[PDB]
Coordinates of N, CA and C in Angstrom, one line a residue:
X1 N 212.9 -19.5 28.0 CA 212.2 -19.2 29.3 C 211.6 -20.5 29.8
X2 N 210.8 -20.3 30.5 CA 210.0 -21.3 31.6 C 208.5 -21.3 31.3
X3 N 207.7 -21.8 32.1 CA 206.3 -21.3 32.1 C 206.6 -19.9 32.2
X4 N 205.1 -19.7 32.3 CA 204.9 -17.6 32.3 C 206.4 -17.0 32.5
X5 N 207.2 -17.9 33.3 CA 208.5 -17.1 33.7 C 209.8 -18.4 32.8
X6 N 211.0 -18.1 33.0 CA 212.1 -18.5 32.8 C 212.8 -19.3 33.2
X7 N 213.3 -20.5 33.1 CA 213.9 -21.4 34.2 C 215.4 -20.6 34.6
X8 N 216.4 -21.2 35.0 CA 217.5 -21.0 35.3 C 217.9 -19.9 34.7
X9 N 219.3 -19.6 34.8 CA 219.7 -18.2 34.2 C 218.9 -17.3 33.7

């Protein structure tokens, strides 16, 4: 994932 959220795909 990313911060709080997910990067790419």
């Amino acid at each position: 994932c990313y911060i709080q959220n997910c990067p790419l795909g």
